[PDB]
């Protein structure tokens, strides 16, 4: 009957509290059948724009191991994640390369993430002295200096704490609402490919 086994996209998508933007939890996924049909439905997940491979061909030309990331970002920064646009959150927190396979998944989370008291546990970076290459993380929290003089110490003028916060009160409209972007990455490294979709009958 060719009965199969699964690997947790239920942990990837239906987790309780996601990670922050500056330290996004990269998860490697191997040795599966990859049921993307749950991912394919446009009713739970509003945005499924794909760049490397088509959504129709996702159950073919299958890959070695896939990389699942995570985000909680505002609705005005979802378009920014995709390659070709540089801004303030895909330039210093998550740089995507010009040609890559795999694609973003964005859905609203006003019920699960927006708290009336507040949600100051999401942090991001908008000052960095250097820039980003594709696909690294910057967990370190040294104080950014905007001037020639060594400012240092507490956060004064031209000292900046580089980890700034979101504000997720539910009074805000569409545009500042948490859109939990999960971006997949597909790679074809020289190895026996073992993440490949369910053919069944």
């Amino acid at each position, epitope marked *: 009957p060719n009965i199969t086994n699964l690997c947790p996209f239920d942990e990837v998508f239906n987790a309780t509290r996601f990670a922050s933007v500056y330290a996004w939890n990269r998860k490697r996924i191997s040795n599966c059948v990859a049921d993307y049909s749950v991912l394919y439905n446009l009713a739970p997940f509003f945005t499924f724009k794909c760049y490397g491979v088509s959504p129709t061909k996702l159950n073919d030309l299958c890959f070695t191991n896939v990389y699942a990331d995570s985000f909680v970002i505002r609705g005005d920064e979802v378009r920014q994640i995709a390659p070709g646009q540089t801004g*303030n959150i895909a330039d210093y927190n998550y740089k995507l390369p010009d040609d890559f396979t795999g694609c973003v998944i964005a859905w609203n989370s006003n019920k699960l993430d927006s708290k009336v008291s507040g949600n*100051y546990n999401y*942090l991001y970076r*908008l000052f960095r002295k250097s820039n980003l290459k594709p696909f690294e993380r910057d967990i370190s929290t040294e104080i950014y200096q*905007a*001037g020639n003089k060594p400012c240092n110490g*507490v*956060a*004064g*003028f*031209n000292c*900046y*704490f580089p*980890l*700034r*916060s979101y*504000s997720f009160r539910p009074t805000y409209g569409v545009g500042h609402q948490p859109y939990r972007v999960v971006v997949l990455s597909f790679e074809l490294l020289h190895a026996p490919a073992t993440v490949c979709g369910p053919k069944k009958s």
Partner: antibody
Amino acid sequence: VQLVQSGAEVKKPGSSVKVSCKASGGTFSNYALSWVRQAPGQGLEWMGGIIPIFGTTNYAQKFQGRVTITADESTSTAYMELSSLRSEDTAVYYCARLDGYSFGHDRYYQDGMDDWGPGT
Amino acid sequence: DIQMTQSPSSLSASVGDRVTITCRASQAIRNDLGWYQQKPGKAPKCLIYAASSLQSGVPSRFSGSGSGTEFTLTISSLQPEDFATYFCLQQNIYPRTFGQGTKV
């Protein structure tokens, strides 16, 4: 959030001027507060900023030490002493919060608060 | 402290013209230029936050652009209350600069 401030002050030279503005409505003492001059025949000009929670002060060019700025977070009032007045140094004065970075709980409010005074 | 320069103040245009107000700095700052509309005898008002990002509560006839040192504001179509003066603010480093200029 609104800013109120006092009326017209001394014009005759040789004296020093106290001008103060108070943040009325949602008293926030973390964001940077700035002073802006405007002449009838000249554009806007920046002289100095104040952090009310820390008390650090940064000034403009060529008149560091002429400007003294005092902050009090308890009464939510910010004071401004400027000495050595000229006849050509007259301008209408504004206080503003044009920098959206809070130093207390790491928040960066994007709008820049649109904070401006009435103008005296 | 770096200075900024704008276009000269002699801009005069009718209703329905393309506007190309320039604003240039002397050091490669990312996007931190703001623009403020000032009417005579009135407090200023923000129009756009920083480069393309636009302030809430205004009509969408305004746009901004620029990534290096050259910075532009563009009006899509003019309005009867367009008669004003527009200022650049540096942000980023603290000594700052107010770039001046008017449009009649």
